Ligand binder design. Structure first.
Ligand SMILES: CCCCCCCCCCCCCCCCCC(=O)OC[C@H](COP(=O)([O-])OC[C@H](O)COP(=O)([O-])OC[C@H](COC(=O)CCCCCCCCCCCCCCCCC)OC(=O)CCCCCCCCCCCCCCCCC)OC(=O)CCCCCCCCCCCCCCCCC
Ligand SMILES: CCCCCCCCCCCCCCCCCC(=O)OC[C@H](COP(=O)([O-])OCC[N+](C)(C)C)OC(=O)CCCCCCCCCCCCCCCCC
Ligand SMILES: CCCCCCCCCCCCCCCCCC(=O)OC[C@H](COP(=O)([O-])OCC[N+](C)(C)C)OC(=O)CCCCCCCCCCCCCCCCC
Ligand SMILES: CCCCCCCCCCCCCCCCCC(=O)OC[C@H](COP(=O)(O)OCCN)OC(=O)CCCCCCCCCCCCCCCCC
Ligand SMILES: CCCCCCCCCCCCCCCCCC(=O)OC[C@H](COP(=O)(O)OCCN)OC(=O)CCCCCCCCCCCCCCCCC
Lengths: 128, 13, 171, 540, 100, 62, 87, 455, 177
């Protein structure tokens, strides 16, 4: 009949064609009421301190401080040696080093072999 | 007339 | 001014303008307006300032460095003589750099001044440039950032061994 | 001698003087944009005298006036090169810029940062005239990075908007990908020819010059929005309309084309560089002019228009005809700046409305804008004996009659038809039809700034192709003997594009609803190229 | 409960007690004299006279000399027919070679 | 829901559903209207990456 | 460009749109005239009235505010809230 | 050099005998007098260095480092006097004395004629820096010091004592003339690593770089300025002095570490695109810029040394200005989160103009000396291998991006609603920005003084 | 889906939003006014053909295939109003929307240029700071225990009191600063 939208990680499924928008069950009602409750509570606790005339400063977000402390300060104690992390620390840590090392060594051995034979065009090359 | 006040930061300093 | 021997130029031959049409061009009138309004006040100001220069004439000099013994007739690990040889070689290295720069200036000026016929008319300047760049490359190339008279002499000895072996295998 | 070089440097110092004026201030200016417009008027009048005494003789020279740096064999001097390219690009750029700024006194009149806007626009003009008067690759790199940085600063002019900063950073990314190739070219010329000065590069005449020309082609692909690196120019319509009119039609986006024109003695000895330029230019002028066929934002349509014309310039560099490409630059500047100015007048009249689906009825509602935009569209399509006839058709006359890639020629002709298709698309949706815009008509174009600014570029779009094409000396031999089906190629395929797109336009008044197939969804989503590479490559 | 501790003091605003504050110090005479000291010995002393001093360095690392000396030597070797530069830096007569 | 425990160092941080800030409600009264986000709500791990200057998750008609 | 609108002008333009509409009699239309309760209109007609307002003034009202404008007085008040008139 | 060391030490009674409100003004005034005095170091010649005594000499490598070092002290005193206005007066004089003692160590680190005196001054600079970072830093193991001194300083000590016993002297002027070729062996290989790895860590090298984006964050402003402006350049200065002795072994032993830098300036630059901390972004940018100095020293061509000393001076200026801009935001929002405070051009236009200039010199906009150093390093590495230009050019894409992303994140967009303590720019702060940027712009008018011993 | 006041869209609100977005994409497909007018009456009649349907599951089924019809017949670039999000002129003047509190940090010689304005602003500040504690104690007894359930704010009740959380709504910047 009609083409289905197939999702992507870089182009996600819309709000309309997702089936969990068109569920009318009671647990969806209660989860939406709980998310409305938490969002309204945090909205109120925000815009009290936001409109507070005694406060002349920065309304600190614990979520933003939590995100900044997550991106930098939770790195090392939650590092465990296993298959995936060590194979990615070897594949992405020393792999491209070996790649560029053999490429640059091959290229400079080729160039030095051409130069010591007197075969490379080095006529007006006096800046180096 | 009916001019509106330009809300701007302090350009004096 | 400068020396026309170290900066050679062919004689500039312009043709006299023969206007085929009757319309007076704005170029000659703007040239005479430039000569009245601009050239003469600048010239009179320069005459007054040049008189003010000539009211106190005084001279500076080009420093002359006498030749000291080179690195070859210095004893090994004798810093008092090989220091002098090293400063001699450094001043000569910088002067050779500026000689190569002068030849580059000649080559670029020849190319622009000849215009489209530069590949015909500047074969001599290109040949002198090829000579001086071949000499600079045999003399100073690949010495590295810690270049010295010792490294240059070692390169010259290796080049002379290659040339001697090349001449000996030819005979 | 004393007049030529003096007025040459007086033009540049005169452009630098209002920068000192805006920087040495305390008070509030008595119309500083009027001061900069008067300054650029005077710089145009100053630069016209060396142009006239180049038309008279052909007097080229070089002003190597300030010895700046000597790196052991490299005498970097402040070196200006007054040849045919500077003498024919500087007065055109000054005339277009003076028209853009008298347009900008009206379009940006409610801006409280109008002084910063004209300062940035004059800084762009200074950097571009550094770019086109440069004699070594370092000063050309100064002008190159200068127009890149002023592209950043003038795309992100309304910096509170996220998409403006997004488009500015995108434009920076694609221009630095071009800068990879330009620094590759500088590196090759320093290591193999010991120079950045153009004179020694042209004199030493390298034979194995594949790598530096590939570097220059990558620089032009970044700068002139060719294929692979084009999407920043459709994104770059986010800024103000005089930014997209001055920079991204006529002055900045021709710099990669100007770089490949400047290096014509190297490209004329290499068939591989000519083949790469011909293929990439035909690819660009196909793809961008095809993506213009399905857009509704008018600045997007004229951005794809100017990128298609840049691809045509890349084609006529690829056929070893550089002076025709440069004449197409100096021709293209007038009417493409005028088309952006008329589109901006339509935008400002319709209360910041850029969508052609909410336009119409502007034939008699905006009669001067109607007249000027019709003349601009005709000079775009190659109407006979308008300014766009005096280069573009000649391009086709040398694209047919040479030892050429045939598929590149055929894509050039398809692009020539597509130009007429989107030109009558612009005329049909914008000026023709019925009003589709909202009900409080505040349509007005009665400012002497707007009238005079469109008027001078309209005199340009009527006369400048004839005047410049008759004032040049012949640097090539024009191919003037060809069969009659091959002489009449570009005009016939242009008229066929006109008629086929009039059929396409008359389909819109039929009361029939059709589902859009893969062609319309392909072209309307920008050939699918800014979708993947802007989501997938920064993710990895 | 936890130890007896002074609370976190709030950051002071230097425009409250001094709308002509330069940010150097809270005492206004000390603040304006710190501004004058910074602006005199920063810009009027170091930058202006420093650009003037660096602008007139007496032939910094003798490049100009080396141009002019080059303008001697090429002039010397256009007259005597000598080539513009030898391939050897030193005399090959005063070099002993390792024999073979 | 947290990230998979392999030792990459995410900790107890939530796996947000990996949608960008373009699909967030553009007309809603946000606390951070340029980022379209609310106070106290747990941000995405790549909140610097899913900004509207950068990589999107929005659906295309093709 | 962009002339300063007044509440009398905005009210006259809103009632001028709604008197060009064939399901509204122009002698019964007032500023307090509810659409579902004084004009008896459909919710689809209310959506089309808000869309006519959007095509009229040149901006979009979100659906969270489009589903709640049920008389022209609230429409003029919302346009006054989103245009800052009587400055 | 004794005409500079003695005023530097007279700054100690000038900072302790002064009045309770005069210890910023006197120290700033007289340190600016010493910085004006510092231009007499430009008595340089094309052949011979400016050799003062047996202990001190100053060629064209150490001279711009000395001028930048003596210029950095008044700028650090301007930077650090705001947040120390709530500090005790005696601890305030302790801070100024630590800065003066650090300047004292640096100005005779760069002019040490003899190499073990260079080593003692080089490892003496770490003590005032560590006192400043640990005492006047903000937040809270210590294994970095141990890993530094195992692979670094004491192998360098044993190496220099070995050179002392073999050659007979560690005078650099004698070692210019008594340098011997160092052949391929294992003894010479560990000798080369023992000479090089201390400066490798002090640059930093990629893979050994993680100490720096934490030491910059845990520092005050003067500590960050003296780290990124001078103390990272002690590694480059020591390498340019020690690669004389290390030939021709470097011609096959520079192959690993160049890889670590040529990929490292790709990685850390990309790490700068994924930062939340502004000060860590400036730190990883400093690592990505010092990687090219490592490459240019290890390939040891003349164009590479000219580009590397130009890049050292230009990066000291640019990174110090970026840390002072980050200080100006940290002293308003009290948080180093880059995504917290946005849209600051709407409030602080001149400070946003200084941000614009600092980001333009960060991404090497010509004709700045950043671009001069960057360009000459790229020319020399293109001469090294014709593939590295890709790894250069990709770097010169990313070095634009985070320079402008940092400009777009903080200074552009919608301003943050819940931050209302954004004061206007104080005159001290704009003075600090201008004294960073105006020397950096004026050196574009005459760059030959910052191009090293072999211009 | 995501609403400030409520927590869900109703079936009636889903039909209204799908109808309105359907007409907007239709007008994007139907550029000319009379052609869109004819097709808009056709789409109105097709929505009227299933208006009086009482089974909710069958209505949700028809709404599901209506979403498939909507996704099948959509325009790639729909028409977006300029000040609307996604438009070309959206958030353009947010670089000119300077907040009000920076007016509290001017020099007095540039406050003396506008004497009446700041003399009139001080009573706004006085009204705010003597209304704040009254509207706080109005919030803390009118909000139920466990936080407020919805994001709707109450109005004032007493003749002489201001609504709660009002200052940055009244002192928000103009659309054209
Ligand atoms: C030795 C003698 C030397 C004499 C000559 C001086 C040489 C240059 C020195 C520096 C000049 C600029 C200084 C001011 C800029 C910074 C502060 C600022 O924003 O002021 C704005 C302010 C006016 O604006 P405003 O409205 O009042 O406030 C700002 C707004 O709020 C908001 O601001 P905004 O965004 O609207 O405005 C910022 C705008 C923003 O614009 C940009 O960011 C665009 C710039 C980049 C693209 C365009 C240029 C590309 C490169 C080409 C140019 C260089 C080569 C040209 C040559 C030909 C080709 C080779 O930039 C400018 O307007 C600056 C123009 C000059 C830029 C210089 C280069 C900076 C670019 C980055 C580095 C490039 C490499 C280094 C080049 C160095 C050349 C010397 O100007 C002043 O108040 C000026 C005060 C006096 C300045 C003195 C400078 C010299 C100090 C040295 C003292 C000792 C020596 C004695 C010399 C004294 C001379 C008077
Ligand atoms: C606006 C005010 C101007 C001055 C007004 C009042 C004075 C009266 C009017 C006349 C002017 C003054 C007298 C004439 C001028 C002095 C003549 C003279 O001897 O000049 C000495 C010299 C001439 O050069 P030089 O070759 O003699 O000396 C250079 C020194 N060596 C050789 C050692 C390297 O300097 C100048 O003339 C400087 C003029 C500079 C003009 C352009 C500046 C551009 C800045 C760009 C910076 C970055 C560039 C990077 C790229 C470069 C290219 C790769
Ligand atoms: C040094 C290492 C440490 C770094 C930090 C140092 C901090 C301490 C600071 C100490 C004082 C400053 C030291 C550096 C001084 C550098 C300046 C200097 O001396 O220069 C000498 C240079 C010398 O150049 P020169 O080599 O030609 O000199 C000729 C030689 N004499 C003078 C003897 C004949 O001075 C100039 O170039 C001055 C030229 C005129 C002024 C500039 C004109 C152009 C300006 C721009 C015009 C507009 C163009 C378009 C732009 C539009 C906007 C973008
Ligand atoms: C240059 C010469 C231009 C004029 C000669 C060609 C004109 C042409 O192709 O005419 C065909 C057609 C007009 O015919 P048609 O539109 O079917 O007629 C009904 C009402 N006019 O279509 C047109 O006239 C439209 C194309 C006009 C192109 C003019 C510029 C070339
Ligand atoms: C002669 C030969 C010619 C050869 C031609 C072909 C070669 C080049 C191939 C294509 C390379 C460029 C395209 C891929 C990257 C594109 C990145 C980009 O532009 O992203 C844009 C994106 C925002 O754009 P968009 O979403 O469209 O904006 C709508 C408004 N919200 O912006 C963002 O999402 C921000 C992203 C920031 C982080 C980017 C991280 C990745 C950086 C990649 C650098 C690439 C370096 C290439 C080096 C090449 C060396 C030879």
């Amino acid at each position: 009949s009609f083409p289905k939208y197939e999702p992507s990680r870089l182009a996600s499924l819309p709000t309309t064609l997702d089936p969990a928008e068109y569920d009318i069950s009671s647990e969806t009602r209660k989860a939406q009421a709980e998310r409305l409750a938490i969002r309204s509570r945090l909205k109120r606790e925000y815009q009290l301190q936001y409109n507070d005339p005694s406060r002349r400063g920065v309304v600190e977000d614990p979520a933003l401080i939590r995100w900044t402390c997550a991106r930098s300060a939770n790195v090392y104690p939650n590092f465990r040696p296993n298959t995936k992390t060590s194979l990615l620390g070897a594949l992405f840590g020393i792999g491209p080093l070996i790649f560029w090392y053999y490429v640059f060594k091959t290229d400079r051995d080729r160039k030095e072999k051409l130069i010591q034979e007197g075969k490379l065009d080095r006529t007006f090359n006096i800046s180096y | 007339g009916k001019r509106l006040f330009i809300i701007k930061p302090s350009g004096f300093y | 001014s400068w020396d026309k021997d170290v900066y050679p130029e062919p004689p500039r031959r312009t043709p006299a303008p023969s206007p085929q049409t009757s319309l007076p061009n704005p170029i000659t009138y703007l040239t005479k307006a430039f000569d009245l309004l601009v050239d003469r006040p600048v010239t009179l100001v320069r005459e007054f300032i040049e008189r003010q220069h000539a009211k106190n004439k005084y001279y500076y000099y080009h420093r002359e460095f006498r030749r000291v013994p080179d690195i070859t007739e210095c004893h090994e690990k004798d810093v008092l003589c090989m220091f002098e040889a090293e400063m001699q070689w450094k001043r000569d290295y910088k002067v050779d750099q500026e000689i190569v720069n002068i030849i580059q200036e000649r080559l670029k000026a020849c190319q622009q001044r000849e215009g489209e016929s530069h590949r015909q008319n500047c074969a001599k300047e290109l040949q002198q440039f090829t000579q001086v760049v071949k000499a600079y490359q045999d003399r100073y190339h690949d010495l590295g950032a810690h270049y010295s008279a010792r490294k240059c002499l070692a390169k010259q000895k290796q080049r002379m061994l290659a040339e001697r072996k090349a001449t000996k295998e030819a005979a | 001698m004393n007049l030529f070089s003096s007025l040459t440097l007086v033009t540049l110092i005169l452009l630098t003087m209002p920068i000192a004026a805006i920087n040495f201030n305390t008070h509030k200016f008595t119309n500083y944009p009027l001061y900069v417009k008067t300054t650029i008027s005077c710089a145009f009048i100053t630069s016209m005298i060396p142009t006239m005494m180049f038309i008279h003789t052909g007097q080229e020279m070089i002003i190597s006036n300030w010895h700046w740096l000597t790196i052991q064999t490299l005498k970097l001097s402040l070196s200006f090169k007054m040849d045919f390219f500077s003498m024919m690009f500087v007065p055109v750029a000054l005339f277009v810029t003076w028209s853009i700024m008298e347009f900008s006194m009206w379009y940006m009149h409610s801006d409280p940062n109008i002084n910063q806007f004209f300062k940035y626009l004059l800084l762009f003009l200074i950097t571009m005239l550094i770019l086109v008067t440069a004699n070594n690759l370092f000063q050309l790199f100064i002008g190159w990075e200068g127009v890149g940085i002023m592209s950043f600063l003038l795309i992100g002019w309304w910096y509170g908007r996220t998409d403006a900063n997004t488009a500015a950073l995108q434009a920076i990314l694609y221009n630095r990908i071009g800068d990879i190739g330009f620094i590759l070219a500088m590196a090759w010329f320093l290591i193999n020819l010991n120079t950045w000065d153009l004179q020694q590069i042209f004199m030493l005449n390298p034979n194995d010059s594949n790598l530096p020309l590939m570097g220059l082609i990558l620089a032009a692909t970044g700068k002139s929005a060719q294929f692979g690196l084009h999407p920043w120019l459709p994104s770059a319509m986010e800024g103000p309309t005089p930014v997209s009119a001055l920079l991204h039609s006529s002055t900045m986006v021709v710099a990669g084309i100007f770089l490949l024109i400047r290096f014509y003695p190297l490209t004329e000895n290499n068939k591989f560089g000519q083949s790469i330029m011909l293929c990439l230019g035909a690819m660009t002028t196909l793809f961008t002019a095809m993506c213009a066929l399905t857009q509704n934002d008018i600045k997007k349509i004229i951005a794809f228009s100017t990128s298609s014309q840049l691809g045509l310039m890349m084609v006529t560099i690829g056929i070893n005809q550089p002076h025709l490409a440069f004449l197409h630059i100096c021709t293209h500047a007038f009417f493409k700046a005028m088309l952006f100015m008329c589109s901006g007048s339509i935008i400002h009249s319709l209360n910041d409305e850029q969508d052609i689906r909410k336009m119409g009825g502007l034939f008699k509602a905006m009669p001067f804008t109607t007249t000027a935009l019709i003349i601009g569209s005709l000079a775009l399509t190659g109407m006979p004996f308008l300014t766009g006839f005096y280069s573009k058709d000649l391009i086709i006359e040398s694209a047919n009659t040479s030892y050429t890639n045939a598929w590149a020629l055929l894509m050039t002709l398809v692009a020539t038809s597509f130009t007429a298709i989107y030109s009558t698309r612009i005329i049909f949706f914008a000026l023709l039809g019925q009003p589709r815009f909202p009900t409080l008509i505040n349509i007005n174009e009665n400012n002497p700034f707007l009238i005079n600014s469109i008027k001078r570029l309209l005199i340009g779009s009527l006369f400048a192709g004839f005047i410049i094409s008759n004032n040049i000396p012949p640097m090539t031999i024009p191919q003037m003997t060809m069969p009659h089906y091959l002489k009449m190629t570009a005009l016939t395929v242009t008229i066929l594009g006109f008629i086929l797109a009039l059929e396409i336009s008359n389909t819109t008044h039929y009361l029939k609803f059709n589902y859009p197939s893969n062609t319309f969804k392909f072209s309307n989503l920008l050939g699918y190229y800014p979708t993947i590479m802007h989501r997938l490559t920064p993710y990895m | 409960l936890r130890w007896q501790e002074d609370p976190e003091p709030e950051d002071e605003n230097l425009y409250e007690k001094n709308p002509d504050s330069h940010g150097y110090d809270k005492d206004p005479a000390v603040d304006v004299w710190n501004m004058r000291v910074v602006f005199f010995f920063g810009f009027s002393i170091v930058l202006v006279l420093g650009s003037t001093f660096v602008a007139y360095l007496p032939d910094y690392r003798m490049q100009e000399w080396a141009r002019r000396e080059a303008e001697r030597l090429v002039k010397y070797r256009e007259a005597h027919g000598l080539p513009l530069m030898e391939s050897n830096c030193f005399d090959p007569s005063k070099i002993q070679l390792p024999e073979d | 829901e947290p990230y998979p425990d392999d030792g990459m160092g995410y900790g107890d941080y939530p796996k947000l559903p990996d949608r960008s800030q373009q699909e967030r409600d553009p007309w809603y009264d946000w606390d951070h209207p340029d980022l379209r986000l609310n106070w106290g709500e747990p941000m995405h791990w790549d909140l610097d990456m899913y900004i509207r200057n950068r990589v999107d998750t929005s659906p295309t008609p093709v | 460009d962009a002339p300063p609108l007044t509440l009398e002008g905005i009210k006259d333009r809103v009632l001028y749109v709604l008197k060009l509409y064939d399901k509204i009699d122009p002698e019964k239309l007032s500023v307090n005239s509810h659409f579902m309760k004084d004009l008896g209109l459909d919710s689809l007609d209310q959506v089309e009235i808000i869309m006519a307002m959007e095509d009229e003034f040149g901006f979009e009202i979100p659906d969270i505010d489009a589903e709640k404008l049920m008389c022209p007085q609230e429409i003029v008040d919302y346009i006054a809230d989103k245009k800052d008139v009587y400055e | 050099m004794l005409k500079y060391i003695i005023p530097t030490m007279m700054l100690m009674p000038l900072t302790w005998l002064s009045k309770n409100s005069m210890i910023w003004i006197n120290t700033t005034l007289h340190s600016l007098l010493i910085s004006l005095t510092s231009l007499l170091l430009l008595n340089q010649f094309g052949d011979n260095s400016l050799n003062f005594s047996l202990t001190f000499f100053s060629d064209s490598l150490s001279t711009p480092l000395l001028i930048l070092t003596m210029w950095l002290l008044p700028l650090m005193l301007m930077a650090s006097q705001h947040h120390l206005s709530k500090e005790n007066l005696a601890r305030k004089k302790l801070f100024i004395s630590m800065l003066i003692l650090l300047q004292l160590f640096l100005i005779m680190t760069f002019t040490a004629t003899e190499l073990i005196f260079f080593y003692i001054m080089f490892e003496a600079t770490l003590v005032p820096t560590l006192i400043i970072i640990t005492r006047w830093g903000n937040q809270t193991a210590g294994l970095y010091f141990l890993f530094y001194t195992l692979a670094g300083s004491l192998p360098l000590l044993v190496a220099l004592i070995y050179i002392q016993n073999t050659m007979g002297s560690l005078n650099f002027l004698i070692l210019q003339y008594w340098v011997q070729p160092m052949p391929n062996s294992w003894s010479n290989t560990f000798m080369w690593l023992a000479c090089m790895m201390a400066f490798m860590v002090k640059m930093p090298l990629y893979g050994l770089h993680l100490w720096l984006p934490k030491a910059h964050v845990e520092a005050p402003i003067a500590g960050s300025m003296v780290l990124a402006a001078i103390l990272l350049k002690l590694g480059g200065y020591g390498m340019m002095r020690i690669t004389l002795l290390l030939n021709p072994i470097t011609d096959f032993m520079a192959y690993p570490f160049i890889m670590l830098s040529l990929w490292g300036m790709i990685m850390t630059s990309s790490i700068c695109l994924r930062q939340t901390d502004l000060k860590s972004l400036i730190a990883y940018s400093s690592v990505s810029h010092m990687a090219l100095v490592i490459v240019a020293i290890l390939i040891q061509t003349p164009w590479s040394y000219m580009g590397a000393t130009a890049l050292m001076i230009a990066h000291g200026l640019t990174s110090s200005m970026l840390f002072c801009l980050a200080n100006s935001n940290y002293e308003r929002v009290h948080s180093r989160t880059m995504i917290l405070a946005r849209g600051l051009q709407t409030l602080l236009p001149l400070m946003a103009a200084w941000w614009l200039l600092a980001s333009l010199t960060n991404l090497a906009l010509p004709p700045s000396i950043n671009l001069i150093g960057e360009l000459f390093v790229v020319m020399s590495t293109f001469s090294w291998s014709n593939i590295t230009i890709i790894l250069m050019g990709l770097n010169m894409v990313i070095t634009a991006l985070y320079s402008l992303y940092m400009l777009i994140t903080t200074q552009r967009g919608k301003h943050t609603h819940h931050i209302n303590n954004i004061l206007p720019s104080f005159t001290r702060e704009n003075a600090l920005m201008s004294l960073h940027m105006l020397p950096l712009l004026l050196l574009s008018l005459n760059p030959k003084i910052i191009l090293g011993p072999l211009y | 889906a995501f609403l400030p006041s409520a927590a869900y869209l109703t079936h009636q609100q889903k039909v209204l939003q799908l109808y309105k977005r359907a007409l907007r994409h239709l007008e994007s497909r139907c550029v000319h006014r009379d052609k869109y007018r004819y097709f808009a009456c056709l789409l109105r009649a097709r929505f009227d053909e299933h208006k009086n349907e009482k089974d909710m599951v069958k209505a949700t089924q028809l709404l599901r295939e209506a979403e498939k019809e909507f996704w099948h017949g959509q325009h790639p670039q729909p028409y977006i109003f300029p000040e609307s999000p996604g438009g070309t002129s959206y958030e353009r003047y947010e670089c000119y929307k300077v907040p009000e509190w920076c007016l509290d940090d001017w020099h007095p010689s540039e406050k003396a240029m506008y004497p009446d304005y700041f003399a009139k602003r001080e009573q706004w500040k006085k009204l705010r700071r003597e209304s704040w504690e009254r509207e706080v104690k109005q919030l803390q007894e009118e909000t139920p225990v466990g936080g407020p359930r919805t994001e709707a704010l109450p109005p004032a009740r007493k003749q002489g009191d201001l609504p709660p959380l009002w200052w940055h709504i009244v002192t928000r910047p103009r659309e054209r600063p």
